[PDB]
Amino acid sequence: HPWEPGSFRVGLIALKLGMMPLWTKDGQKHVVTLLQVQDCHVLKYTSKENCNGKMATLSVGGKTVSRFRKATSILEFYRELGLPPKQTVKIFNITDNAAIKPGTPLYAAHFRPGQYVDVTAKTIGKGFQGVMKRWGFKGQPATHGQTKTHRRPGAVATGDIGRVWPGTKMPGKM
Amino acid sequence: AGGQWRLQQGLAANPSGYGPLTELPDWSYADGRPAPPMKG
Amino acid sequence: TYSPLPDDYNCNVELALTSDGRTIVCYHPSVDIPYEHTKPIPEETHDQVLKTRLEEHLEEGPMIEQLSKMFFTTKHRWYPHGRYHRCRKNLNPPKDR
Amino acid sequence: FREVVETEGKTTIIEGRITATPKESPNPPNPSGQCPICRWNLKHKYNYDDVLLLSQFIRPHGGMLPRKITGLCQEEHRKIEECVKMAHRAGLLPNHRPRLPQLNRYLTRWAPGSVKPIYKKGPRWNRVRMPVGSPLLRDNVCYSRTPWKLYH
Amino acid sequence: SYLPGYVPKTSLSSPPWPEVVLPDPVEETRHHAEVVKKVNEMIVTGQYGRLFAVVHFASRQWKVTSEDLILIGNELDLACGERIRLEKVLLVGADNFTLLGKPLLGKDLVRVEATVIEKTESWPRIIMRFRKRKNFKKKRIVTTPQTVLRINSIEIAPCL
Amino acid sequence: SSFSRAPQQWATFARIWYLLDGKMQPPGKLAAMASIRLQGLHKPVYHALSDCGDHVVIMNTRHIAFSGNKWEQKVYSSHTGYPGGFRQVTAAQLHLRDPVAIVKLAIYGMLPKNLHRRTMMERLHLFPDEYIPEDILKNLVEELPQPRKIPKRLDEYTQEEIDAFPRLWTPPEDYRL
Amino acid sequence: KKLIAEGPGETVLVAEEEAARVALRKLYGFTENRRPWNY
Amino acid sequence: FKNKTVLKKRCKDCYLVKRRGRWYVYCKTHPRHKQRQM
Amino acid sequence: VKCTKARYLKKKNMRTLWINRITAASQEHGLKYPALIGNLVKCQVELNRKVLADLAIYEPKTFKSLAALASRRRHEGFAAALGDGKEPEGIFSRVVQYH
Ligand SMILES: [Mg+2]
Ligand SMILES: [Mg+2]
Ligand SMILES: [Mg+2]
Ligand SMILES: [Zn+2]
Numbered sequence A: 001h002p003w004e005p006g007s008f009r010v011g012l013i014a015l016k017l018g019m020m021p022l023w024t025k026d027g028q029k030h031v032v033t034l035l036q037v038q039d040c041h042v043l044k045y046t047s048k049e050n051c052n053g054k055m056a057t058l059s060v061g062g063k064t065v066s067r068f069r070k071a072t073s074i075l076e077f078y079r080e081l082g083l084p085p086k087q088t089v090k091i092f093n094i095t096d097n098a099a100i101k102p103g104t105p106l107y108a109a110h111f112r113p114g115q116y117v118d119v120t121a122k123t124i125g126k127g128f129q130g131v132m133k134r135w136g137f138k139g140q141p142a143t144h145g146q147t148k149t150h151r152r153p154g155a156v157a158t159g160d161i162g163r164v165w166p167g168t169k170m171p172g173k174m
Numbered sequence B: 001a002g003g004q005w006r007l008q009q010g011l012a013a014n015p016s017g018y019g020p021l022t023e024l025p026d027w028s029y030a031d032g033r034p035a036p037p038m039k040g
Numbered sequence C: 001t002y003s004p005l006p007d008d009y010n011c012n013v014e015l016a017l018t019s020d021g022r023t024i025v026c027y028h029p030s031v032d033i034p035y036e037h038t039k040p041i042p043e044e045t046h047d048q049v050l051k052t053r054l055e056e057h058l059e060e061g062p063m064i065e066q067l068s069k070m071f072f073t074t075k076h077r078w079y080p081h082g083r084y085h086r087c088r089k090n091l092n093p094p095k096d097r
Numbered sequence D: 001f002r003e004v005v006e007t008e009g010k011t012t013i014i015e016g017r018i019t020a021t022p023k024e025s026p027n028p029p030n031p032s033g034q035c036p037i038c039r040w041n042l043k044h045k046y047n048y049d050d051v052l053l054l055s056q057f058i059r060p061h062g063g064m065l066p067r068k069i070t071g072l073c074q075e076e077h078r079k080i081e082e083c084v085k086m087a088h089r090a091g092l093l094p095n096h097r098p099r100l101p102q103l104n105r106y107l108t109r110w111a112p113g114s115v116k117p118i119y120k121k122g123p124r125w126n127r128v129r130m131p132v133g134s135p136l137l138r139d140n141v142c143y144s145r146t147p148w149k150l151y152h
Numbered sequence E: 001s002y003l004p005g006y007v008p009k010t011s012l013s014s015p016p017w018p019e020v021v022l023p024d025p026v027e028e029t030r031h032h033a034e035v036v037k038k039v040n041e042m043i044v045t046g047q048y049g050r051l052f053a054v055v056h057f058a059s060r061q062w063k064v065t066s067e068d069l070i071l072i073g074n075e076l077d078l079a080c081g082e083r084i085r086l087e088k089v090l091l092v093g094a095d096n097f098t099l100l101g102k103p104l105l106g107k108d109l110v111r112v113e114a115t116v117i118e119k120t121e122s123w124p125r126i127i128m129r130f131r132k133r134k135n136f137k138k139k140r141i142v143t144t145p146q147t148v149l150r151i152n153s154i155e156i157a158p159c160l
Numbered sequence F: 001s002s003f004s005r006a007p008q009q010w011a012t013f014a015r016i017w018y019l020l021d022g023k024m025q026p027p028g029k030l031a032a033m034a035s036i037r038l039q040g041l042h043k044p045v046y047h048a049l050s051d052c053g054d055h056v057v058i059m060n061t062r063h064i065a066f067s068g069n070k071w072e073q074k075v076y077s078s079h080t081g082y083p084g085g086f087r088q089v090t091a092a093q094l095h096l097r098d099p100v101a102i103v104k105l106a107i108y109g110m111l112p113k114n115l116h117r118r119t120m121m122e123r124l125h126l127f128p129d130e131y132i133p134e135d136i137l138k139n140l141v142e143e144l145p146q147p148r149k150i151p152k153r154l155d156e157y158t159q160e161e162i163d164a165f166p167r168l169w170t171p172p173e174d175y176r177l
Numbered sequence G: 001k002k003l004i005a006e007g008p009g010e011t012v013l014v015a016e017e018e019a020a021r022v023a024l025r026k027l028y029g030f031t032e033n034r035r036p037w038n039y
Numbered sequence H: 001f002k003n004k005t006v007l008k009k010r011c012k013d014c015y016l017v018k019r020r021g022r023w024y025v026y027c028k029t030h031p032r033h034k035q036r037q038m
Numbered sequence I: 001v002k003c004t005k006a007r008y009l010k011k012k013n014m015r016t017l018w019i020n021r022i023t024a025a026s027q028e029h030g031l032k033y034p035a036l037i038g039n040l041v042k043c044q045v046e047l048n049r050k051v052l053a054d055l056a057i058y059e060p061k062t063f064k065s066l067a068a069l070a071s072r073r074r075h076e077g078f079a080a081a082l083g084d085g086k087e088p089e090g091i092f093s094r095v096v097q098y099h
Helices: A072-081 A131-135 B003-009 C060-071 C083-088 D036-040 D074-090 D135-139 E025-045 F005-012 F027-039 F091-097 F101-110 F116-123 F134-138 F159-164 G012-028 I002-029 I033-042 I049-058 I060-082
Strands: A015-023 A029-036 A042-045 A056-061 A089-094 C014-017 C023-027 D002-006 D014-018 E052-057 E060-064 E068-072 E083-086 E091-093 E097-101 E110-121 E125-131 E136-142 E145-156 F017-021 F055-059 F075-079 F086-090 F125-127 H015-019 H022-026 H035-037
Touching: B003 I033, C014 E025, C014 I060, C023 E025, C023 I060, D074 D135, E025 E097, E052 E110, E060 E068, E060 I049, E125 I002, F005 G012, F017 F027, F027 F055, F027 F101, F027 F116, F075 F101, F086 F091, F091 F101, F101 F116, I002 I033, I002 I049, I002 I060, I033 I060, I049 I060
Parallel strands: F017 F055, F055 F125
Antiparallel strands: A015 A029, A042 A056, A056 A089, C014 C023, C023 E097, D002 D014, E052 E060, E052 E091, E068 E145, E083 E110, E091 E097, E110 E145, E125 E136, F075 F086, H015 H022, H022 H035
């Protein structure tokens, strides 16, 4: 079916290779990331009734990997579908008119220049880090007699409260 | 319950006070003999 | 014809008094459930299908929440207790009647 | 009653015509009564739900009638005007929706939009209790032993 | 045409509950007589089965039947194995009828018989009184006497 | 009786699926009756330790009405747990967002504050509309009546009632109206 | 079109067999509400 | 505009009414006569 | 001390659950506990709450008869409220005079 107002389109998954520059007609520079798409097959379709959600949903796979390091049920699913495994399988909300059959590859031609997009992905793992470089606190000075208190958070909360408010910024996995 | 009603009728407000519910003997011999009075 | 209560569900009740009026008597024959207020009740080629043996076992959370939904209760009472309570529980309790 | 109509090319004609005037019943239960409530024994025995008589003291758009014409007491007039506000707010009178080019509700003294919400309710001894009904119907006969609780 | 006190039908023009009227006293006396007659005739024929009766005893009430045990928290001065007739009864009930008094039933109508089975001292009950930071600490042990009866039989008289 | 032990015990301590229609009824009253029946006071064998509750179903919770401007001034208030997480919402907005939560919180307040409260509240069932899943409109027993009465509309009042109700006064003819 | 006994039960089979038991008790006269033993 | 517990009509054109839950006093000729009820 | 002090609490708790059972039984038969007890006292039946509860449990027919009695006594009391004297007193409202 053709595009209609308010409709949506299934997304996809890509693989970040790196960054490189670009230049405009005005001589202006724009950094730009490259996103590579190896296989990016469709995996599953659902009805908005089955899902009981606001909108229908599809499933898309990422990269093909070893068929050996998976679960038996997942391998059964991939076999009865016909495609190899995929390490990531993400979900895309979509209208019903845009229903796509499984086993269909998603090439990079879905998008075009002069277009806007959103991208979701996992962040760089810095591990357990300090309150300062996690949240952006000033810390404490170095000289003037600071006794082993340089990168501490300082105070936390008041005295009458007798506790700590949930959602407070303290060190943790970043 | 019903204490004031019993009072205006002429009976004890608490039925355990007096009347046949408490004054009569609560046990007698099966042969028909009268039991001794209760200490109450 | 005056009735104190609807005599159509448990028993047909009537009161009465002695001639002196010192004792009350009640006649309360039970009700007969009408018939009208009732309801009626409700692999071929080869054998060994009679086995019909299927074994599924779930893990803790899913099974406890399943049977809790099936008995209409919470998930808490299903978790096991400790040896303290298990051994404090009286095993041969008294029973009446 | 009279119906007026204003009607032609470059000319217009305004005309008022009499209409069928209904009448009361010929047997007033309580003579020597100057107000209808006293003539019919309806001084403390009406409410919002019994709208049969309320329909008599209203305009088709849903407007209240004047005391000078209706012949009622001041207290009874304010009683019935409040009661008619209650009825309209409950929505029992759909045919009298006034003039043109969501929620169930009942027993509402004041208007819904005007009232501000109580972002805080005080303690037991100075609580902001919610109004219901009106002191006007407080004199209504209460078959129950407890009185009407107007402020929740 | 309308009585002065007449009123139209409204929400509260009349009470909310439904109007009611009591029957005629003569017909009601006839009904009482018929019911008493049939009850007496039936219990004379012997239609009933078990009999559960209420009894005021030891300053409190009980529901009892035949072949049932009962405990009382006092001493009666009755040797074990002895039989007694209980006088006070609030009512008596069978499967199809019941007889209740105003307040209690006549002596001639029923005969409740009970046998003594056991005389004991109650299990040791403890009475401790303690108050706070005033070395007020005190205890006492009590073993109240208690007697066990068994209701052996109940029978009613046709008198009515 | 003359019944067997286990079947008699079962029939006595059995649960029952009650139903009541909340269309133009007050959540307070309907929730009060539902709560008493949930903890099981209605049966003479009530005891807290004995879980003798019964399953309850409310119907048309969306079509309930308060008395007064409660839709506007009644405030359901809750703290999420974070700073500034103190939220207040009128009954009207809370009904728009979840038409069941009103009756739910009503019963949650009516009920005692024991650990059996959650069990009884999950026994209870709620549905804003005249529609029910198969099993849970099949395995029912009885529909108890409503607490209050529905006042009738002028479009509902028949003609004979109207012409029986006497007219009260005679208007003057000379009046626009 | 006349009832002799009713029986409660987990299932319909248990209910009907219990009703049969009740009717048998009623016919043989060993109902729980029978005359006690006379001594 | 100004809020007073007790209201007063300065000029005949001042007219007092009851709007959105409170008493108001409006005068189109003298807008400074506008007066809210606290 | 808690074993001592729990005795009167036992008394009160049992009285409360008795009265609650009785209120429930009356309300499912169509009556309320206050009127029920008042009517029974007026009709001269001294059935304490524990036996009332046991009766309502084990023989609902007799409890239904008691509820009918109480309701009839309520209606007789209403007729008396209409006319205290100048009328024949209720048949069940009649009382026994002892001496
Ligand atoms: Mg620094
Ligand atoms: Mg140092
Ligand atoms: Mg340093
Ligand atoms: Zn002005």
